[PDB]
Nucleic acid binder design. Structure first.
Ligand code: ZN
Lengths: 42, 403
RNA sequence: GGUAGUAAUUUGUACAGUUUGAGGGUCUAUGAUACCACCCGGUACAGGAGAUAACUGUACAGGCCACUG
């Protein structure tokens, strides 16, 4: 239901995730450059 | 094996930035990536400073963070940082600390009259022993001669006997004399421990133990030349008594170990108030030959060493004098935070902090070096790590209360 | 006297793992019902990794006519 803390997997929980590490990306715009605070619309 | 633990080239720039963010998170948790692959355990990619624990992966770092030990260590580090920023005490605070130290000295401290009463006790001992052992004699040692122990501290007497006599036989016939004599009662074989019938103070008799008398005289001199030392040592001893660290049977440190630590602090201040028996001034002195050095005898405002003499008290141009309370707070800072008791020896003889590897010492808990017994660990009574942590917590709490 | 080893037993610390417990959720307006067909979002944050006791094994400090001369 909610995006996981690491690797951004909804169904996968953070503890359950066994995938290789992935960059943390802003969910609002899926942008690596812009975080939640720096969203272009904000 | 010479390659990096994590290769930036293999990872993309986006991946590299993500890994850098992950490592920043790990840094906030005190987890630091290994600069190079360890030869013994190259698998580990990170290390935890709090526990000094190798971590294979970032997820393992989070798992370690979940562990209670990491939380306890981070709490300890937070307490240390909080203590670090405490301001030095104001002049009123220093005066109050000095007044408290003086009050503690008056309440529980050995004075001249107590020494005269103890000399009277030794005189009674000499009177009763004279009939049977005219050759043998008695002297004060330990807390008695030092004047740095409490007034309630048990009498300590040492026997001088001829070379032909042997320490076990001498102690045995001394025990017999204590048996028959009416003056001494509740006598036990145990040193010989008894309860004085008239004075009412616990009494202990010893034979040989020349090193104890030497250290006691050295500390007596250090107290005499240094006036601030005695109040500081008495206050520190009172703190140990309150915390129960003074009691040996419970795993606490011996009493005079606290005085040794106090003199070590005074010697290691930024402006040294007391000198070191061994220093760079001595010709041929070295840490490798430190064991060869030894202390021979105590002179008035002078010391004797063999492999030459050193002054008991430093003689410097306009030597600084500061209040006793200021020295006490400085000692609290020196031992609670400034001094790592784990792996640094409290070596009075040498200015340099003797490493444990030099003496092949445990490196586990509080460690103190005897002035005359280089090979003896006077803190061996403290053999439990929980008790060691208890002493550190008590010292830090005392610093916080007084700062 | 020093070094280490040491069955049967005695303390202390955790818990890699098992399992029992209350709690935790918050977030409803966004319906799709009935045993006619059961599941989408707007109220609702941040860059934040989620237990304490009973239980199993494993190294580590002390105790033990343990243990040694
Ligand atoms: Zn995930």
């Amino acid at each position: 239901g909610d995006r996981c803390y690491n690797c951004g997997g909804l169904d996968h929980h953070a503890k359950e995730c066994k995938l290789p590490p992935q960059p943390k990306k802003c969910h609002f715009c899926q942008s690596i450059s812009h975080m939640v605070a720096s969203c272009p619309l904000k | 094996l010479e390659g990096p633990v994590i290769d930036e080239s293999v990872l993309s720039t986006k991946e590299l930035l993500g890994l850098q963010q992950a490592e920043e998170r790990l840094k906030r948790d005190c987890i630091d990536r290994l600069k190079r692959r360890p030869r013994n355990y190259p698998t580990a990619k990170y290390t935890c400073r709090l526990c000094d624990v190798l971590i294979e992966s970032i997820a393992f770092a989070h798992k370690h963070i979940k562990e209670k030990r990491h939380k306890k260590n981070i709490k300890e580090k937070q307490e240390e940082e909080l203590l670090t920023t405490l301001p030095p005490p104001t002049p009123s605070q220093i005066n109050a600390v000095g007044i408290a130290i003086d009050k503690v000295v008056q309440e529980f401290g050995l004075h001249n009259e107590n020494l005269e009463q103890r000399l009277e006790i030794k005189r009674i001992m000499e009177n009763v022993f004279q009939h049977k052992l005219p050759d043998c004699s008695l002297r004060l040692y330990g807390s008695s001669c030092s004047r740095l122990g409490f007034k309630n501290s048990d009498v300590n007497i040492d026997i001088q006997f001829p070379a032909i006599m042997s320490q076990p036989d001498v102690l045995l016939l001394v025990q017999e004399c204590l048996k028959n004599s009416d003056s001494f009662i509740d006598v036990d074989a145990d040193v010989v421990v008894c309860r004085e019938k008239q004075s009412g103070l616990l009494c202990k008799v010893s034979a040989g133990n020349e090193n104890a008398c030497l250290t006691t005289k050295h500390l007596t001199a250090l107290g005499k030349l240094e006036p601030k030392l005695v109040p500081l040592v008495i206050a520190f001893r009172y703190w140990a008594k309150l915390c129960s660290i003074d009691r040996p049977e419970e795993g606490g440190l011996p009493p005079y170990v606290f005085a040794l630590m106090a003199i070590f602090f005074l010697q290691q201040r930024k402006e040294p108030l007391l000198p070191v028996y061994l220093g760079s001034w001595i010709e041929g002195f070295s840490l490798s030959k430190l064991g060869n050095f030894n202390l021979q005898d105590i002179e008035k405002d002078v010391v004797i060493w063999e492999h030459g003499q050193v002054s008991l008290i430093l003689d410097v141009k306009h030597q600084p004098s500061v209040p006793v309370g200021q020295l006490w707070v400085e000692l609290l800072r020196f031992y609670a935070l400034e001094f790592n008791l784990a792996d640094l020896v409290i070596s009075i003889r040498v200015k340099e902090l003797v490493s444990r590897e030099l003496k092949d010492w445990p490196k586990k808990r509080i460690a103190i070096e005897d002035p005359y017994s280089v090979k003896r660990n006077v803190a061996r009574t403290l053999n439990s790590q929980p008790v060691f942590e208890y002493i550190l917590h008590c010292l830090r709490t005392t610093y916080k209360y007084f700062a």
